[PDB]
A paper describes a structure:
CtSal cleaves the C5 side chain of bile acid thioester steroids, whereas a previously characterized actinobacterial homolog from Thermonospora curvata (TcLtp2) targets the C3 side chain. Each aldolase forms a complex with the hydratase responsible for the preceding reaction in the pathway via their DUF35 domain.
Crystals of the CtShyDUF35–CtSal complex diffracted to 1.95 Å resolution. The CtShyDUF35–CtSal complex adopts an αββα heterotetrameric (diprotomeric) architecture, featuring a central CtSal dimer flanked by two CtShyDUF35 domains, with a total buried interface area of 9540 Å2 (CtSal–CtSal and CtShyDUF35–CtSal interfaces; calculated using PISA). However, while the zinc ion is coordinated by four Cys residues in all homologs including TcChsH2DUF35, CtShyDUF35 coordinates the zinc ion with only three Cys ligands. In CtShyDUF35, the repositioned zinc ion compacts the β1–β2 loop against the α2 helix in CtSal, drawing α2 closer to the steroid-binding pocket. Consequently, the β2–α2 loop protrudes into the active site in CtSal, occupying the region where the steroid nucleus binds. The CtShyDUF35–CtSal tetramer has two distinct pockets separated by the β2–α2 loops of both protomers, unlike TcChsH2DUF35–TcLtp2, where shorter β2–α2 loops create a single long cleft across the TcLtp2 dimer. The 30-residue β4–α4 loop of CtSal forms part of the wall on either side of the substrate binding site, while its central region (residues 127–135) spans the top of the active site but is disordered.
Author numbering:
A (entry chain C), B (entry chain A): 1 to 126, 136 to 404
C (entry chain D), D (entry chain B): 3 to 144
Amino acid sequence: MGLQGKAALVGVAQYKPQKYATAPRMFHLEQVADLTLQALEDAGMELSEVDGLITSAPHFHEASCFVPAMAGEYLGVRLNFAEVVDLGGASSVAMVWRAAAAIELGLCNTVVCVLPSRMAPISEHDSRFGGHSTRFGAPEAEMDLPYGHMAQNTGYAMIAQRYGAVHGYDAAALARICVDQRFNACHNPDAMFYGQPITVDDVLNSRMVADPLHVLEIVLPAAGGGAMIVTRADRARTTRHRPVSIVGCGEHVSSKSPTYMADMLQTPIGPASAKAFEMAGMRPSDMHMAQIYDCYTITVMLTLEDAGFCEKGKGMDFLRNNDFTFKGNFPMNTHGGQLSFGQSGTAGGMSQVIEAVHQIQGRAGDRQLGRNDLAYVSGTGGVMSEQGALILRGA
Amino acid sequence: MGLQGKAALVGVAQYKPQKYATAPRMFHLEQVADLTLQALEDAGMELSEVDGLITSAPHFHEASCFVPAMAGEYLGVRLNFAEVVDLGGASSVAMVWRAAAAIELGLCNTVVCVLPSRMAPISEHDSRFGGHSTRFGAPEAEMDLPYGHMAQNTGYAMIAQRYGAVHGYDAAALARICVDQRFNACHNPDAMFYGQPITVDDVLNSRMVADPLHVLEIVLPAAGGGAMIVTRADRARTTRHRPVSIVGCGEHVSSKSPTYMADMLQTPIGPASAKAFEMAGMRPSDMHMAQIYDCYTITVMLTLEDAGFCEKGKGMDFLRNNDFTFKGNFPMNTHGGQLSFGQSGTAGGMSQVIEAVHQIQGRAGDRQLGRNDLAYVSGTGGVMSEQGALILRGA
Amino acid sequence: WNKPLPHPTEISAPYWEGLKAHEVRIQQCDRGHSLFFPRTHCPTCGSRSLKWSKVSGEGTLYSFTVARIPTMPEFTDEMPQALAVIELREGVRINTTMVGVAPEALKVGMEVRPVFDERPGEVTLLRFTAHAGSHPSVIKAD
Amino acid sequence: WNKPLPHPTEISAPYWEGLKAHEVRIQQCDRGHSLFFPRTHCPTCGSRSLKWSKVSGEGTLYSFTVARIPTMPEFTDEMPQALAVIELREGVRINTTMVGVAPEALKVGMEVRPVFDERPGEVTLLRFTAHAGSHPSVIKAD
Ligand SMILES: [Zn+2]
Ligand SMILES: [Zn+2]
């Protein structure tokens, strides 16, 4: 049951994360074409082979609706699967397994998952709340906003405060995530913070946003984008690189605000990762790498626990006693993660997937892992809201 | 390797189509809850069983993004599949096969497919192009709008005019679609035009909207909404009515504007229907009913041709030589279709799926088909843009 | 008051009206499930039989944080923002802020009691304080 | 013009500038595929090496319709709107309207000529007319 591993990632492409002030301006339709063709060239396939497309539903600059039709028309493809997702940072992992499902279902042969994240040029004839809805009837508009609750920082901070009171807290242990991932980024010329190492005290000395989260434990919004090609296992054999099979997946959404979680310390990556490991017939100890969605340090540590890599409540202990660099025993976000490689909006989650593909394909350069067969990848949207997991295995 | 038919429609719910003046206003989250619970009650299931949710992505009144999360939180369900679609009128059939794909893949036991279509209450603190985008970079904003091309009426008129030039045109033949479907609605107390029979003359003498399309050949806009429960085959055994298995599906999007179609007369419902018939191991001649998306009479005739019910260029004569009432030899849109039952905005296409479920479950009252086991269902968005096809089979 | 205010719907209206009467009123389905935020259905069992009833309003601090950068510039006069999540004895959770408690004494699990904030004017907001503290139950408009 | 006007992008600017020069410019990849609307890639083969080719603007009327109800009030002075789709000799299709011919006279497949509509002032639009007709190739602003 579940995915049988007959779909594989064969081509990737992504813009270098760059600050909004200086990043190139590109229409979202233009980005869709540019990123798809780049990823197709990386795979060694041409345009007419694409019979499936997945992208993000909200905030597509040129279309408030009919996004698949307009994007596919601009691209020039004939789609048997016209898909959009609306899961925030979890979107990237959500598109990957949907592409595999459609290919294993026989609907498609080759699916492109693409997320534009650069802003479009401005015309003379043409966000405070951080994504919270102000619409009449939206519960959070009347229950969150009047009290200052909004966006993501303070929500994740209240999760961190709950964890500290229940299981203990070590500010320096969480800072280990920033230091090791920055080390990884310091060996990635494409990373935003390439050549910019940090220390533990650097993180603690950075400004407090909301107790106990510091600015350096939080991603810096940036522009970018990315796309990935998924195709059938047989066609994958004649592509350019090692196929990266999609052998397990999981998805879970049980709340929007963390306030209505059954337990803010039981995050949805638990159920999602248990389904993905089960589907792949594998266990956390089988993985050679973990590309973990890292908008906040606390999200990484909670993913470490709930995905089964360490015991619930010993996350700080796991962070103190392990080396998370590409030279370490538990390589993690070996591209730098969104924290240090840069967060390209909703495409930031795709950096995790692409790095897993790079590592498995033997294309990671100075950061290449010795064991590069098996990868766990997570995606997280909102504040512990939307979650997905992937198990990937090289051919 | 398509669907194995292990998911089934078990419960439906549908607001009666109403003009926007009589139409009550409810929040889209409110409609999600109300319609979901009505459909669950129709199937005899509980809210606790729902672990999958599909709805429409754009113009969700209370949320421009994170629609699955806000709706799932408001409804109170824990989702292993959080899905949105952006395919216009083809959204309903698109949701059904996605729900079956997730159930057969093992992620969900029960998926709710819901489309709010009533407007929300207005507030002090809170569209002349008919859905066309005006955004900078949208191709139709500069290639369509300044020349008056927009909305749907003229686009379908230009497809009809092209057909008449290539294959000949018979306006009285199209009128039979209106007459026979109105006859069906005349035996449907829930239909908008219940008890109001019309003749071919009434259709031909109605006002011309855009040559060669008459007023009576075009749906009128109305408010409504619908929900649909899909569940595993085994759980469907103990639900209240006959399970309606989803044995075949297909999807195709190859153009937004018909101007860029390879050929406006070769429409994307063909490829989608061929895949659905192939996957169900079935032929058009095996169907006991055809519930065809009918926002325009020309859509129905082209769907009959391209789906395989008659030869290309012969659709005019098929309309002349067959009886499309529920008493006829080719029962079609037996609830009256959107033309005579009412078009509930985006939820209009759901009326085609619901009527098939009603027929297959033996719940269609006076219009009940004696032979009620196999159904072909189509959904169409835009101007022959987004297309989906379903083959449904009673248990 | 330049901050965001609630714009009650006809679904949530009885809750914001109860606060105006210095009462915390939440819905309870006919099977015994309390719910919040307000809905037209029970998010636990789906029942449509909901009854509004006053609750004592006391509970525990489920979690909290202290904003050192204001979440919005118009919350500067509330700084530092003691953002809090309260779980009433009924088991529902309410977003709010703490008043009359030093940020450094905030502690996950403290007993809390409601404070009705009339400063916005026509709208009454719901804040919380330490149960054993002396902070009054109402904050009148300036 | 009070009606909607094109807002050219850096991608489509050469086409709209071409109309100002009384030219119909259509992109072609170096593999020979023509494309419209304008893009930065070939929608056929994915090539990024595109050139702007000068075409005669001649073609055939692919389809048409006569608007009896205005697509919006702003086009009432153009009634009845002869909405049209032209297929150029090179194979691309263009949305437009027909001028210099009766709307009810049109026929699918008839040969057409381009007509550069300068009436909006700074923006020139592309209309079409019968190839054998007497309508000029330009409409000078009023
Ligand atoms: Zn209940
Ligand atoms: Zn080309």
